Design a protein around this ligand. Structure first.
Ligand SMILES: CCCCCCCCCCCCCCCCCC(=O)OC[C@H](COP(=O)([O-])OCC(O)COP(=O)([O-])OC[C@@H](COC(=O)CCCCCCCCCCCCCCCCC)OC(=O)CCCCCCCCCCCCCCCCC)OC(=O)CCCCCCCCCCCCCCCCC
Ligand code: BCL
Ligand code: BCL
Ligand SMILES: CC[C@H]1c2cc3[nH]c4c(c3C)C(=O)[C@H](C(=O)OC)c4c3nc(cc4[nH]c(cc(n2)[C@@H]1C)c(C(C)=O)c4C)[C@@H](C)[C@@H]3CCC(=O)OC/C=C(/C)CCC[C@H](C)CCC[C@H](C)CCCC(C)C
Ligand SMILES: CCCCCC/C=C\CCCCCCCCCC(=O)O[C@H](COC(=O)CCCCCCCCCCCCCCC)COP(=O)(O)OC[C@@H](O)CO
Ligand SMILES: CCCCCC/C=C\CCCCCCCCCC(=O)O[C@H](COC(=O)CCCCCCCCCCCCCCC)COP(=O)(O)OC[C@@H](O)CO
Ligand SMILES: CCCCCC/C=C\CCCCCCCCCC(=O)O[C@H](COC(=O)CCCCCCCCCCCCCCC)COP(=O)(O)OC[C@@H](O)CO
Ligand SMILES: CCCCCC/C=C\CCCCCCCCCC(=O)O[C@H](COC(=O)CCCCCCCCCCCCCCC)COP(=O)(O)OC[C@@H](O)CO
Ligand SMILES: CCCCCC/C=C\CCCCCCCCCC(=O)O[C@H](COC(=O)CCCCCCCCCCCCCCC)COP(=O)(O)OC[C@@H](O)CO
Ligand SMILES: COC(C)(C)C/C=C/C(C)=C/C=C/C(C)=C/C=C/C(C)=C/C=C\C=C(C)\C=C\C=C(C)\C=C\C=C(/C)C(=O)CCC(C)(C)OC
Ligand SMILES: CCCCCCCCCCCCO[C@@H]1O[C@H](CO)[C@@H](O[C@H]2O[C@H](CO)[C@@H](O)[C@H](O)[C@H]2O)[C@H](O)[C@H]1O
Ligand SMILES: [Fe+3]
Lengths: 320, 258, 343, 274, 58, 45, 57, 53
């Protein structure tokens, strides 16, 4: 068959690309880049250099302290037993504060460490957002990456900061652990009545599925047209070639309409962004303006009428 | 205790949902308008009837290009000229296909052999106006990596097993440091370029396999205007010629196989 | 071949073998038996592995019981010296019950597990003192809690229901705060974020029995109306409710849909009648632990108690032992009327 | 109507079945043999859905619920009013999806493109086939398929998930979610980078591979490149669907207990087993 | 051992050493805070904890 | 030690040191606020 | 059998052997530590719990 | 045996040895803290253990 362009075995070693000159006052790029044949198989072979400005170093320091708070408490929760740490690592977490303390500062053993880790991690994420914004400007690029990142931060802040404030308790926020934060996700749905019936949860899923649909379609489109230089997308945007025309005609002949090599990336940008934008809004609504999503769904005529195959039963707590 | 109720039936979450629907309707309108910056207005089977569909075409936007190769405004007020493709319609009614003409359908400009009239100048690098694609005899700072195949000196073979020539040099992308074309010296002394995405480097037998063209059809592939650089338009011509072989190399490849 | 490629292939080869080891060492296989219990397409049904079910049926085989002797003649209350609960039983049936209790509780140790072999009336051994309280517990269950143990059929319970031929039943529980952690300012052991055997080895709370099956903390967390204003239950509380409901599945060998429709957990209009029976099971367990097992704290020796010194307690799996009904609903108390009435 | 550049591309050929008989366009859509077949299955399947809705108790679009047969029917074809209609709609859906994929193959061949797009779509079809035929076949009853209804099939997902009492602990479920979440992160990054390069601040020149690769080397120390990101987009999206199919095929045919219990193999490893 | 600094970069060693020593010191201070006996702030008497399984404060 | 600024960028040292000191100071203030004895706002319980 | 080093590069063999021997020894030491009989620090594992229950609401 | 530093880079060996020994020493110190008997900070008898027969 034809070359499927799955991976690249024929590779050439050129001079390392350090990037465009930076604006006056910027730091020097860190590290000496080197060629790696393994990464050249599936993508670009060069590793480095990296730019570490003020935002990058500040974000790392803030984030590292937060990670240390999580890890030290996780290790203390198994009484410093390394065999138990490896055994239980997925089960461990840094738990959010007890409901007693509301929005106030909890004692260290009862959620105080969680709040400090939440603050330092949030600062690190925000400082990383500045890094994504400023690195784009330094290269003369648009800030689309930073604003897409802000959408992801919105869901993160809604889960851990905005909604706990709206509910009046840091106890509603997720824990810092792998299995426990899955427990929190499930317990959230149990408490607030089947989050499937949250319409913004429906939309977020539609865009999450849609992001997988679009990237499979778009990635497949580019791979199918790499024989025409389809992966050189910006050059296709400013001077349309046969790769762009065939890509547009494939989808027009398939489903009756098509994008362009520029607008497809707008479809992809919004579909990913709307996952966390609609998701964040849905999380802010539950417990604040809706307490049971299934009963809200029943009220708004979206609960399918499933037959009841059992004899009628009365709540035994009422007759007691 | 009814927190979030606006009326007896309308609540806050419902209102926020309808607010999103209005935004999403506007977003789809915006996205569909952006989709219409290329290829619109549509052409019909009427000399001067054009359709823009719904939503209408957006206001023009301008791209500034590097190294004084001009400004591009999309949607174009006057669309780019099309190539003079040679095909005969299979029927007169709208929606019917056409059949490419000529003994070599890969040169007809119809079907998969068509291409766009791109810039007739090489794509330049950003740092310097130097052509982006260059043969490794010119781009001496690029060398083949070890523990990977070296196609120089391999035979160029069509899918029918006929050897069309030998690989003499490779063309690299000076921006991404990768191979994009293999240059082959054909048996008629032609020195054509073959697309790397359409080449299977079999380092076991020392052959570069072409699944798209027979050996004799390789001999009619496009040649460069000058041997050390390739324009954007020439890149489209080369890609169209080789890729159209999957449908035009043999009569079997164009017909239903079952 | 490039060294980085070799390392990547070796790492991929190791992972594939490791995945193969986990997959072939843990997974089950078809055929699987399905018992549909809800409406078509609502995915309310029970799964049963036939190989697991065959093993389960083998260990729930009811032992044959001695035939019941006539109740005419001398009564054990008059004949024997220290008989406080089995007074109305005839001598022949009293001896039959003692033989039955021996096989049900301590078949290996015989009559000497509870009795001084030369003085049967003596209560020197703590086991006899517990046994007398256990008889009262069985009589209490069969008479006053037939809303649960005789919900559909006159099943009832006997000593074998929990003990299964062992002095210590397989399924008991103690007050468990969780494993020891670091002290000082480190995050406290809250009974969560550790592997919880009672909660299917998840990170859900590891002791849901203390607040619910000994104390009477509210299990319900869901609001009964669409909009807020009536419910202040926290996600923290939902953890313990989730953990207790996980223990129900293990205890009965069923899943959530056996008692619930997942689209509304709080709904009783959408629930099978098994949820009503389970509701009384909670109150029965609290009665057993608060009134029978806990007051026996001083009678139990210290090695029979928990790390906190509390007496061993009953929960759902003590009787059910992984089956939707104990011994698949087979009744053993029908030929033991003395175990169905409170003295 | 056709795009400005379209007319030269409308060649005859590329079909797998039929040939010139169905090789024509209706408006912007190419038909071919599988377009006829896809149209037939799609229209019949949709019409049967409406008829099944007509037999139901509501016309509310959100509340229409077409359910599979009872488990007791096994692998037999049930009567139409008791899950037989669901089975017919399922067969139409399977035919429509396969025809759509095969139609895409012919369209890609007509344009001389690779077959990457239908290849990627085939994994979506595999997940659907896992849900409605493969998993029900291993369980021995068509009643295991999800009901056809906008909100009613969420009820099937919810109840199915709680048949294992904590579906987050399903290991293939974790992998599939990791692929879905990473794909959305990758899509947001890729869409942003292209738009940022093609749409710099007003009056500034458009940016190319030097800034695109330079951007992620500056922020993260590595750039996968334009070819790599489109490979990654397919790989992440395809593997999300593949591991989704795995996560549900093992739920019930190969695992009948709570998913958290499955992790006891890790807890009981002899290096740290209690 | 002066000859070792011709083999190891003083920039690399000092930066790696500073990070390593701070993390180690931070870890040891945390471990002491995670003991009752060596807790220097509140002392040896650990405070009582609040109920985790509690409703929202309303 | 005046030569330590010959091999270390003073701009880079000050930025790293400045962030480190502020993060450490935030860490210590946060710890004290979460203690019973050294909470200076609501005081001891 | 000295010829084994004419076939394999010594640098890789020693590094591979050193990594292999440490991981195996770490594996064996940990397996014994998890047992009651061969635990050389405390012996049988008692599974200590926290001193008190977290109070109910 | 001195003919090993020409075969192995001393810089790579010392850095690898330094990381390995520190991680190993952390591992052992951590394990002793987890034990009841060898905990040198809080000492023995830190939790509750059920009596055995
Ligand atoms: C969510 C909802 C998703 C809904 C998706 C709907 C997709 C509809 C496909 C429309 C096809 C089409 O023709 O495009 C028209 C339209 C573009 O029209 P145009 O190019 O401006 O107009 C051309 C001229 O009018 C000139 O046009 P023309 O006259 O050439 O057009 C003729 C066209 C007819 O088109 C129309 O007249 C317009 C119909 C509008 C409905 O074709 C036909 O006549 C069809 C005849 C019947 C035969 C079809 C079957 C034959 C076999 C085909 C193979 C099997 C299928 O494309 C769209 O409207 C697409 C917008 C949909 C965006 C959806 C984005 C996803 C949102 C997901 C949200 C999830 C979270 C919430
Ligand atoms: C039983 C569980 C419930 C359920 C409970 C919830 C809850 C609760 C939530 C969701 C949410 C979502 N659910 Mg749900 N959900 C259910 C069933 C489903 C099903 C299904 C087929 O059954 C699907 C496909 C989904 C899918 C989804 C997504 C659409 C959405 C998550 C978006 C996202 O990508 O967040 C992932 C992305 C983020 C969380 C942002 C991350 C960005 C930050 C910046 C990360 C920084 C990392 C940092 C630098 C590193 C730190 C490392 C340190 C060591 C800590 N759910 C069932 C009904 N679901 C979320 C939502 O938005 O709902 C409206 C949400 O909160
Ligand atoms: C439990 C009973 C005792 C106790 C029992 C023991 C026993 C038994 C031993 C120790 C040993 C040590 N104990 Mg003690 N120890 C206790 C409690 C403590 C406490 C505490 C807070 O309570 C501390 C801080 C320590 C600290 C120490 C260290 C001084 C020492 C481990 C050396 C090491 O890790 O080298 C690791 C670091 C190196 C080897 C440096 C490597 C140099 C390289 C080769 C050169 C190049 C460097 C390279 C460029 C940079 C990378 C290296 C970096 C360090 C990462 N112990 C309790 C009180 N302890 C060990 C010891 O004394 O060793 C001499 C030992 O045998
Ligand atoms: C549109 C929504 C989707 C999305 C988008 C998105 N995410 C993004 C972005 C975008 C557009 C970015 O630009 C940003 C990024 O940088 O991407 C490369 C990012 C990002 N999304 C990430 C994760 C992420 N995204 C997720 C989800 C999503 N992201 C959505 C699906 C998730 C999920 C599903 O949970 C995760 C986990 C990160 C990879 C990145 C943000 C990175 C960040 O915030 O970095 C700072 C955080 C830290 C914890 C600091 C780390 C510190 C180091 C570990 C220290 C190492 C040691 C140290 C050097 C020692 C010395 C220290 C001294 C103090 C001693
Ligand atoms: C992996 C770390 C590799 C690394 O840290 O490499 C460093 C250089 O990093 C550099 O350029 C700067 C780049 C360092 C980071 C490289 C990228 C890390 C992976 C990021 C991409 C994955 C995550 C993306 C999504 C979050 C070390 O460089 P040297 O010691 O000078 O030489 C390395 C020798 O091979 C040749 O001399
Ligand atoms: C599919 C992608 C995800 C769809 C999400 C659907 C959300 C369903 C929840 C819902 O149904 O939201 C409703 C509105 O949704 C609506 O109009 C939605 C109307 C369709 C919006 C556009 C969808 C694409 C076309 C709000 O309730 P009510 O206004 O009281 O409804 C009254 C009747 O319409 C139903 O009894
Ligand atoms: C630190 C690193 C951690 C990664 C660990 C990866 C482990 C991968 C293998 C996991 C094995 C799980 C398993 O294999 O499942 C267990 C079986 O294990 C058995 O036999 C023995 C299983 C054979 C060993 C598996 C292969 C080990 C060697 C290769 C390692 C790579 C399940 O037990 P049962 O079927 O109930 O009864 C087994 C009987 O012998 C009675 O006890
Ligand atoms: C609402 C849909 C409106 C569609 C209007 C339309 O346009 O349908 C046309 C008529 O199709 C035709 O009758 C011939 C095709 C008949 C219907 C299509 C096949 C249906 C199969 C079921 C499409 O045929 P074309 O001549 O290829 O295109 C004409 C356009 O260029 C006009 O500008
Ligand atoms: C496989 C064998 C399927 C036999 C179905 C069958 O049953 O054969 C007949 C009906 O078939 C019917 O119409 C419907 C026949 C259904 C065929 C099922 C197999 C098709 C598989 C398609 C997908 C394969 C993917 C690989 C006879 O039906 P009964 O015996 O009255 O049914 C009683 C049920 O309890 C059986 O479970
Ligand atoms: C040598 O060191 C090592 C040993 C290597 C360290 C090892 C560390 C390790 C292994 C760490 C592992 C960590 C792991 C596995 C973490 C996993 C975390 C997961 C999955 C988290 C998931 C979700 C978490 C979320 C959403 C949390 C959000 C929290 C937020 C937003 C909190 C914000 C509040 C802010 C901004 C405040 O201002 C409040 C602060 C204050 C008022 C003081 O307190 C109230
Ligand atoms: C790929 C092949 C995989 C085959 C898996 C084995 C078939 O799976 C098996 O199907 C049969 C028939 O549907 C089921 O059989 C069950 O339902 C059928 C149909 O009502 C009854 O007639 C039967 O008495 C009952 O046991 C089994 O409970 C199930 O385990
Ligand atoms: Fe792209």
């Amino acid at each position: 068959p034809e070359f499927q362009n799955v991976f690249t075995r024929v590779q050439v070693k050129g001079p390392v690309h350090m990037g465009v000159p930076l604006p006056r006052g910027s730091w020097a790029r860190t590290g000496k880049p080197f060629h790696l044949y393994l990464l050249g198989l599936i993508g670009d072979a060069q590793i480095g250099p990296i730019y570490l400005g003020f935002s990058g170093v500040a974000s790392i320091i803030f984030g590292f302290i937060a990670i240390e708070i999580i890890g030290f408490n996780m290790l203390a929760s198994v009484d410093w037993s390394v065999p138990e740490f490896f055994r239980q690592f997925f089960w461990l977490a840094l738990e959010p504060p007890a409901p007693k303390y509301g929005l106030g500062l909890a004692p260290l053993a009862e959620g105080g460490w969680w709040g400090m880790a939440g603050f330092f991690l949030t600062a690190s994420i925000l400082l990383w957002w500045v890094r994504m914004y400023r690195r784009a400007r330094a290269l003369g690029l648009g800030t689309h990456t930073a604003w897409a990142f802000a959408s992801a931060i919105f869901l993160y802040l809604s889960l851990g900061f905005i909604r706990p404030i709206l509910m009046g308790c840091w106890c509603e926020a997720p824990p810092f652990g792998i299995f426990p934060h899955l427990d929190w996700t499930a317990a959230f749905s149990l408490r607030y009545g089947n989050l499937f019936y949250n319409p913004f949860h429906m939309l977020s899923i539609a865009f999450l599925y849609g992001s997988a649909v679009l990237f499979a379609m778009h990635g497949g489109t580019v791979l199918a047209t790499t024989r025409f230089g389809g992966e050189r997308e910006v050059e296709q945007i400013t001077d349309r070639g046969t790769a762009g025309e065939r890509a547009m005609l494939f989808w027009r002949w398939t489903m009756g309409f098509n994008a362009t090599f520029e607008s497809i990336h707008r479809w992809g940008w919004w579909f990913a962004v709307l996952v966390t934008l609609t998701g964040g809004i849905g999380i802010l609504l539950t417990g604040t303006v809706v307490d049971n999503w299934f009963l809200w769904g029943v009220k708004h005529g979206i609960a399918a009428p499933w037959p009841n195959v059992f004899p009628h039963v009365v709540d035994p707590a009422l007759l007691a | 205790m009814e927190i979030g109720a606006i009326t007896q039936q309308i609540d806050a979450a419902q209102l926020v949902l309808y607010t999103f629907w209005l935004f999403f309707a506007g977003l789809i309108i915006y996205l569909r308008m952006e989709d219409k910056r290329e290829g619109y207005p549509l052409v019909t089977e009427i000399p001067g009837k054009f359709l823009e569909g719904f939503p209408p075409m957006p206001a023009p936007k301008t791209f500034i290009l590097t190294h004084n190769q001009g400004t591009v405004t999309v949607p174009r007020a006057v669309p780019r000229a099309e190539i003079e493709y040679k095909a005969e319609p299979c029927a007169a009614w709208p929606g019917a296909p056409h059949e490419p003409v000529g003994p070599n359908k890969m040169l007809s400009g119809a079907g998969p052999s068509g291409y766009a009239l791109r810039f007739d100048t090489p794509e330049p690098t950003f740092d310097t106006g130097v052509p982006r694609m260059a043969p490794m005899r010119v781009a001496t700072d690029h060398v083949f990596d070890e523990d990977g195949p070296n196609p120089i000196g391999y035979d160029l073979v069509g899918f029918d097993g006929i050897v069309a020539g030998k690989i003499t040099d490779a063309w690299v992308d000076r921006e991404e440091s990768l191979v994009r074309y293999l240059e082959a010296k054909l048996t008629n002394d032609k020195s054509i370029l073959v697309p790397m995405p359409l080449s299977r480097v079999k380092d076991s037998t020392g052959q570069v396999l072409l699944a798209s063209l027979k050996g004799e059809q390789v001999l009619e592939a496009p040649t460069l205007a000058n041997p050390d650089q390739v324009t954007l338009r020439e890149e489209d011509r080369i890609a169209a010629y080789f890729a159209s072989g999957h449908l035009y190399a043999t009569q079997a490849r164009q017909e239903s196989i079952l | 071949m490039n060294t980085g490629v070799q390392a990547a292939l070796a790492a991929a080869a190791v992972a594939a073998v490791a995945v193969a080891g986990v997959v072939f060492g843990t997974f089950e296989r078809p055929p699987i038996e399905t018992v549909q219990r809800g409406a078509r397409g609502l995915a309310m049904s029970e799964l049963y592995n036939p190989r697991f079910l065959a093993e389960t049926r083998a260990e729930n085989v009811v032992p044959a019981s001695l035939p019941r002797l006539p109740d005419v003649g001398l009564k054990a209350g008059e004949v024997y010296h220290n008989v406080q609960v089995l007074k109305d039983v005839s001598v022949g049936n009293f001896t039959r019950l003692m033989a039955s209790m021996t096989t049900w509780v301590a078949p290996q140790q015989g009559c000497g597990y509870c009795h001084n072999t030369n003085n049967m009336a003596s209560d020197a051994k703590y086991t006899k003192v517990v046994a007398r309280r256990m008889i009262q517990m069985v009589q209490h269950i069969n008479q006053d809690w037939k809303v649960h143990v005789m919900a559909n059929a006159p099943t009832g319970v006997v000593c074998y229901t929990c003990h299964r031929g062992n002095p210590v039943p397989k399924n008991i529980w103690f007050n468990n705060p969780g494993p020891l952690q670091a002290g000082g300012y480190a995050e406290a052991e809250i009974g969560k974020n550790h592997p919880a055997p009672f909660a299917n080895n998840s990170s859900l709370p590891l002791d849901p029995f203390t607040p619910f099956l000994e104390h009477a903390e509210n299990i319900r967390v869901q609001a009964t109306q669409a909009l807020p204003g009536t419910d202040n239950s926290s996600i923290k509380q939902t953890y313990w409710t989730y953990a207790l409901m996980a223990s129900f599945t293990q205890a009965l060998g069923v899943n959530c849909t056996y008692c619930h429709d997942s689209r509304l957990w709080e709904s009783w209009d959408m629930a099978p009648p098994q949820r009503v029976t389970a509701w009384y099971g909670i109150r029965m367990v609290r009665d057993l632990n608060n009134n029978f097992l806990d007051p026996l704290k001083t009678t139990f020796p210290d090695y029979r108690r928990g790390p906190l010194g509390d007496s061993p307690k009953v929960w759902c799996a003590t009787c059910h032992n992984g089956v939707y009904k104990p011994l698949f609903g087979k009744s053993m108390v029908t030929t033991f009327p003395e175990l169905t009435k409170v003295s | 109507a056709m795009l400005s550049f379209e007319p030269k591309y409308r060649t005859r050929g590329g079909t797998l079945i039929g040939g010139d008989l169905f090789d024509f366009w209706v408006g912007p859509l190419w038909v071919g043999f599988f377009g006829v077949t896809a149209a037939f299955f799609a229209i019949l399947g949709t019409l049967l859905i409406v008829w099944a809705a007509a037999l139901g108790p509501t016309w509310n679009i959100w509340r229409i619920n077409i359910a599979p047969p009872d488990i007791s029917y096994g692998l037999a074809f049930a009567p139409l009013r008791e899950g037989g209609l669901w089975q017919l709609i399922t067969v139409c859906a399977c035919g429509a999806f396969v025809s759509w994929a095969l139609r895409q193959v012919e369209i890609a061949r007509k344009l001389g493109m690779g077959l990457h797009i239908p290849f990627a779509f085939s994994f979506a079809i595999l997940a659907y086939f896992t849900l409605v035929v493969f998993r029900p076949l291993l369980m021995g009853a068509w009643g295991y398929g999800f009901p056809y209804g906008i909100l009613s099939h969420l009820d099937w997902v919810s109840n199915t998930g709680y048949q294992y009492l904590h579906f987050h602990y399903n290991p293939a479920h974790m992998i599939a979610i990791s692929f879905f979440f990473t794909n959305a992160l990758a899509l947001a990054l890729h869409g942003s980078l292209i738009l940022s390069a093609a749409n710099p601040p007003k009056g500034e020149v458009v940016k190319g591979a030097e800034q695109e690769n330079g951007y992620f080397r500056d922020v993260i120390g590595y750039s996968i490149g334009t070819l790599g990101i489109h490979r990654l987009g397919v790989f992440l999206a395809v593997s999300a669907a593949f591991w989704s199919a795995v996560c549900i095929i093992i739920s019930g045919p190969f695992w009948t207990r709570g998913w958290p219990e499955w992790w006891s193999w890790w807890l009981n490893l002899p290096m740290w087993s209690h | 051992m002066w000859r070792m600094w011709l083999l190891f970069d003083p920039r690399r060693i000092l930066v790696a050493l500073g990070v390593f020593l701070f993390v180690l010191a931070l870890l040891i201070h945390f471990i002491l805070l995670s003991t009752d006996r060596f807790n220097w702030l509140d002392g040896p008497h650990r405070g009582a904890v609040a109920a985790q399984m509690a409703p929202l404060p309303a």
